[PDB]
Amino acid sequence: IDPPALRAAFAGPLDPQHAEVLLSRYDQHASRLLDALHALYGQRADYASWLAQWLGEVGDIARQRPQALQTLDSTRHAGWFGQPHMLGYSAYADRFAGTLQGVAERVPYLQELGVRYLHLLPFLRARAGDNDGGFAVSDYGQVEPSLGSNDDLVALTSRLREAGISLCADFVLNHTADDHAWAQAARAGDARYLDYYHHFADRTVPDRYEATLGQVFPHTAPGNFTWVDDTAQWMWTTFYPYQWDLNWSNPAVFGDMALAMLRLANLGVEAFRLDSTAYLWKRIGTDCMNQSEAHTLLVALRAVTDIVAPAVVMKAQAIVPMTQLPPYFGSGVDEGHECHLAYHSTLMAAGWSALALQRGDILHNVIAHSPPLPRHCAWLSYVRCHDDIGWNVLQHEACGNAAQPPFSLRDVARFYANAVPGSYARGESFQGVHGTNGMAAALAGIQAAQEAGDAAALAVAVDRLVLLYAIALAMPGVPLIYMGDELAMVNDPGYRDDPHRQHEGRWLHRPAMDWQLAAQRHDAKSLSGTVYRRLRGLIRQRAALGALAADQALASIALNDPRVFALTRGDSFIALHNFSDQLLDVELAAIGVDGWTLLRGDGSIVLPPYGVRWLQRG
């Protein structure tokens, strides 16, 4: 290619007043972008032609970036998302406050909680009919009418931004709704857009891929491939049948998606949850996951953002085994130049496992096996979310090692399914071992306690819930609270009586916000008020501990008491966790300390059942 030629295409649509800063960033990241793109599409006859054109469109989008956001681009500090005041909150805009304007009216609630990061679930145009809770996107550039307009989105981000809250939005970049403008163009016979997806005239290729492909909905939707009349072909569909996998091997797809992303950024979104990002690249003979190219694709999108909107962050999802997570942060030449965040799905699943089995040693294993985060990278740590808990990511760990004996994922799954006598949990099986649905409060024993009017059990359960969250709060990066958990909200059986949802078990833990329950957060004596106060405590404390910043180290101290989990941050902070229902103490000699206690140390630390203690070493 011809660098000066490509740079000129990019510049040009730029405003003379901002041309200097942008061209400066373009000069330091462009090469990475170009190398990534070349490895992906360099062999194509129309490469150089597409690049130049595309680059010209990237520059025009760069010019349209509102001044306030450009200023943010220049003032924001790298690794900003990893500061100790960062607290995350995830929820559906509709379940939470009806519309985007309604959500804006609720910002005072988020501010009171201490939220600085707000993830709104899919809110862009979704397929008519069932749209997988918004995950079948029909237009990446338009808010879903029932939720509002693009104007409300902009007004919302401006409101959140002044409250120090960064909007995280889903970029469902692996697949589109089958009614997206592209699928409709494809369905109409437009070969150009038909090529934006994976399509096959026969069952030939599908049969092959299926030989080594796993399944996301083995029961509900063995839909991994679908025959579509309109296109007269088999369409790759990893998820529901109406969600078509995009063909990222086509530069057109890459170019249009990078643009879509930059337009969202321009509307004020600061963080992009790259949904199903492990499935991006398809290659025969492979499970088509975590492929090397998927990573190159991410490096490219990352370069595009470093140049056009550096204040923006990319968060990888990927529900995969531990060894597959860290590479989303970039590898070798590209380490530190891929995703800034990754959901620590292993830590989260390991937490519920540790709780059911009353084994702190399982958490020690996860942390010990958690490699140190690269420069300006961090974890998205969490307790629950809109999805089912995927246990199978803990297979390797379940096998056990020299320090930790084996554990049964099957036993854990049954415990939370309440298919085993004595269980305080009330969840359900989703799709052998696979997944479990249910609210945190429902899994922690709170729902069962309330169900039986047993105050003793309720308190113990509150402890279990707080325990799990204390861990996420002690982690380097963004601890994401799932809507309602701060009030101990329980399951929502309502979907069962709904022909539109009864088929999707995950609705069990996707309730509408209980604002009357929210008002109780004040009555310190109420359950909600109690849970809310305990969490609020840990949040205010973590905000005051520079030792918890993402740049500080994360490690765990090996103990011979299987029930305890000792987590350390930097060299001055240690959090002790008792995952058993038994009172016990941790000897200071077992952690090499002798000091302070957070929101006084001389002798072992006594930890009640399911208790947590934060201490400042020394």
Ligand X SMILES: OC[C@H]1O[C@@](CO)(O[C@H]2O[C@H](CO)[C@@H](O)[C@H](O)[C@H]2O)[C@@H](O)[C@@H]1O
Among 157, 176, 224, 276, binds ligand X (CB under 6 A): 276
Nearest approach in angstroms of CB 431 to ligand X is 7
Tell me which DSSP letter residue 397 carries.
Answer: H
CA distance 297 to 289: 13
Q: For residue 33, what are the contacts with CB-CB under 8 A and spacing of at least 6?
A: 300, 303, 304, 307
Q: Is 261 exposed, middle or buried (0-12, 13-18, 19+ CB in 10 A)?
A: buried
Nearer to ligand X among residue 483 and residue 575 (C-beta): 483
**Is 239 or 482 the residue whose CB approaches ligand X more closely?**
239
| Stretch of residues binding ligand X (CB under 6 A), selected from 178-186, 380-388, 421-429, 520-528 | 380-388
* Cα(145)–Cα(154) distance, integer angstroms: 15
Contact window for ligand X (CB under 6 A) among 52-60, 387-395, 402-410, 515-523: 387-395
**Which is nearer to ligand X, 73 or 275 (by Cβ)?**
275
> Between residues 246 and 355, which has the closer beta carbon with respect to ligand X?
246
239/407 with CB nearer ligand X: 239
- Tokens read off for 453: 């009017």
Q: Which is nearer to ligand X, 132 or 152 (CB)?
A: 132
H or E stretch covering 33? helix 19-41
**412/408 Cα distance (integer angstroms):** 6
**Distance of closest approach, residue 132 Cβ to ligand X, in angstroms:** 5
Site for ligand X in 358-377 (CB under 6 A): none
Compute how many residues bind ligand X; rule: CB under 6 A: 14
Q: How far apart are CB 177 and ligand X at their closest, in Å?
A: 11
Q: Figure out which of the listed residues 315, 376, 386, 510 binds ligand X, where binding follows CB under 6 A.
A: 386
The answer for residues whose C-beta is within 8 angstroms of residue 398's C-beta and 6 or more apart is 406, 407, 408, 409
Nearer to ligand X by C-beta: 114 or 133? 133
Positions in 125-144 near ligand X (CB under 6 A): 132, 135
- The DSSP symbol for 326 reads G
The packing angle between helices 251-266 and 47-64, to 10°, is 10
What is the total residue count of the chain? 618
Cβ pair 410, 400 in contact under 8 A: no
Q: Does residue 239 bind ligand X (CB under 6 A)?
A: yes
Contact between 29 and 307 under an 8 Å Cβ cutoff? The reply is: yes
Taking CB under 6 A as the binding criterion, the range among 88-96, 385-393, 443-451, 473-481 that sits at the site for ligand X is 385-393
Rounded Cα gap, residues 17 and 8, in angstroms = 16
Q: Which of 206, 255, 360, 390 binds ligand X (CB under 6 A)?
A: 390
Which amino acid is located at 336 in the chain?
A: G
In 3D space, the residue among 162, 161, 160, 171 whose CA is nearest the CA of residue 97 turns out to be 160
Taking the complex as a whole, how short is the minimal distance between the CB of residue 202 and ligand X, in angstroms? 26
Rule CB under 6 A: which of 299-318 touch ligand X? Answer: 317
Q: Of these, 152, 245, 388, 486, which contacts ligand X (CB under 6 A)?
A: 388
Of 94, 152, 245, 275, the one binding ligand X by CB under 6 A: 275
Exposed (0-12), middle (13-18) or buried (19+): which is 387, by Cβ within 10 Å?
Answer: middle
Which span (181-189, 382-390, 452-460, 514-522) binds ligand X, by CB under 6 A? 382-390
Nearer to ligand X, 47 or 217 (CB): 217
CB of 18 to ligand X, least distance (A): 36
Going by the DSSP 8-state scheme, the letter that residue 197 receives in this structure is B
Question: Rule CB under 6 A: which of 417-436 touch ligand X?
Answer: 435
Nearest CB to ligand X, comparing residues 427 and 445: 427
Angle 429-432-438 from CA coordinates, rounded to 5°: 15
Q: What are the angstrom distances between the C-alpha of 177 and each of 134, 245, 260?
A: 9, 9, 15
Indicate the residue among 72 and 316 with the shorter CB distance to ligand X.
Answer: 316
Chain residues binding ligand X by CB under 6 A are: 132, 135, 172, 216, 239, 275-276, 317, 319, 386-388, 390, 435
